[PDB]
Symmetry: C3
Subunit: 245 residues, 3 copies
């Protein structure tokens, strides 16, 4: 399978102040190289699209997205898709990128949204997906408020009574350090739950298959133990295959 | 016809980062200056009040606003009214400025609010007009959440079935690139809709007339095509004459 | 009486810009220094715990907090408790600090929360306590949206019919410049109100006593009329004695 994987490294800008004075330091954080590694190890052929490309070169055509068996959006807020540089800084007229994605799913394409601070509703409600059009595509309902459920203690998920390829191979989950609180839509399937809330949900949107994972595939919610985990590489591949065109 | 126009230029402070290092550049983005000239070309005598002046020398009396036939508020959030330098840095007691505006309208004042990231509920719910004395003055209900509807692809508003002098001269709107999502109150008149939502809303507040335009008069929601439109200047002049005292 | 007092000074970072260029200046505001000097000298033994001490060395066992009669949280967001440095930057696993306070209170410890921008729901909803274990502990329900009610004109609180030790010695309040808007829960007693909303709410959490004060013990809501009040010091001492474990 061929997938489009949309994600990015956090940029970090650090102001250091003492008394009157300040200096800065800056750096980056590294996204999901590990998850991308795992996906290349499994069958999967991946096109990584960083947030920068999305902002500057996002495809303007359904056909441009047709060769992908599935799309993944990992911890990028909607603003990034809706306020591309040409829209925000030039006032060119540009296709709704999110509508393209939703159109692409309706024709059989698969979609996976992976949680984090910039997923679903997100920290300070900045991911803001509920107000988008994708809302209608996801097998979940989102909150109005900041989404995060922070779990410094850690908390481990339990699989669901539902039996599924993704979830068959294992039973004990590794600790996760948080997730986006979601509500499952009526006719969707919850495969695991965390702190009583849903963790993995599947639904369809017309012809296409949709999946939400409510925690992050990486730090800090995706704990060292979760990245470690014997089942991590295959879990992710199964999910991808479960939504294949 | 004599009006008080409250608005401003955006200030932009830009942090450029690469590896360890940053440098910064700064500029101003240019506000409603186009609209101001247009009003001046019609009847209208305009007192331009920048948010700087709102912050330092806002009138302390609703009699001081009384020489104005209307007050326009353009994409300036409530914080700017409620947290004048006196109040916020010095704890000096002063009249709630939104209340003076409310009083002013009640005694027959016109009020226009023009949308943007800092109108109504606003980007990230920052403009925050809902939790404000002005919420009952306006002919609209507002969302608890981030208001914005972004239309990178643009969207042409339509005139409603209500007939009006404002909307009389033209049938077809130029595209706009976003608007605040609002709900028309009961006794209010919707003259135009965009994307199935109210664009232009007239109502009353005791003896005063009130208007809500849900998009922006400037970039980036205000498309160039909007700005260059043969009707733009007469539309805004009309809107003002309409809400005159 | 020995209490844990949790708060901080504001750090201020200032970007000054003019045309292209900027420079910066930075400083500190001030925490509850007055209020602390007031609590001591009313023979209250006070451990001051700055955020930062919260962020690096926060008690991780029940035994640790047990030697405290009450805990004071003043103007500190939930993020500071949940996202300590070791969770957020180190990827360690530490226990939920707010479970800790909850546990403590249930075991008969007293809690006081003082309002401000990072209390309750807080400014731009950042304090975020409603999506938190403490929500359950507090004698108030919190809003989904931005909590603040700004009162630049100031408003005098009025005592309630309920007779109480805290409330006897005065009847007229000095003006406050804003507060967090809350709603009293059922089994809870409101001892004072401001602008027709709760200001002093008393309650219990299993074996423990809880108190919410809806305004700030310091600037800018905490007016100079409030700090120079005759009843100021005694008022807080009484609040504390009222929640002594």
């Amino acid at each position: 399978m061929k997938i489009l994987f949309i994600g990015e490294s956090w940029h970090i800008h650090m102001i250091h102040s003492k008394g009157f004075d300040s200096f800065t330091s800056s750096k980056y954080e590294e996204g999901a190289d590990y998850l991308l590694s795992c996906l290349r190890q499994g069958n999967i052929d991946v096109d990584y699209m960083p947030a920068h490309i999305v902002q500057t070169r996002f495809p303007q055509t359904a056909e441009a997205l047709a060769c992908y068996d599935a799309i993944v959006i990992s911890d990028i807020g909607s603003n990034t898709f809706l306020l591309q540089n040409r829209t925000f800084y030039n006032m060119d007229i540009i296709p709704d990128a999110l509508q393209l994605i939703a159109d692409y799913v309706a024709e059989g394409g698969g979609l996976l949204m992976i949680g984090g601070y910039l997923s679903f509703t997100g920290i300070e409600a900045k991911a803001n997906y509920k107000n988008t059009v994708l809302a209608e595509v996801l097998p979940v309902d989102m909150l109005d408020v900041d989404d995060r459920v922070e779990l410094p203690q850690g908390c481990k998920a339990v699989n669901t009574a539902v039996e599924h390829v993704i979830t068959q191979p294992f039973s004990e989950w590794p600790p996760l350090l948080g997730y986006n609180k979601l509500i499952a839509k009526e006719n969707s399937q919850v495969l695991a739950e965390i702190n009583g809330d849903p963790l993995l949900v599947m639904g369809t949107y017309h012809k296409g298959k949709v999946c939400c994972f409510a925690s992050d595939c990486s730090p800090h919610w995706g704990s060292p133990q979760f990245l470690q985990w014997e089942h991590y590489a295959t879990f992710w591949c199964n999910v991808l295959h479960t939504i294949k065109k």
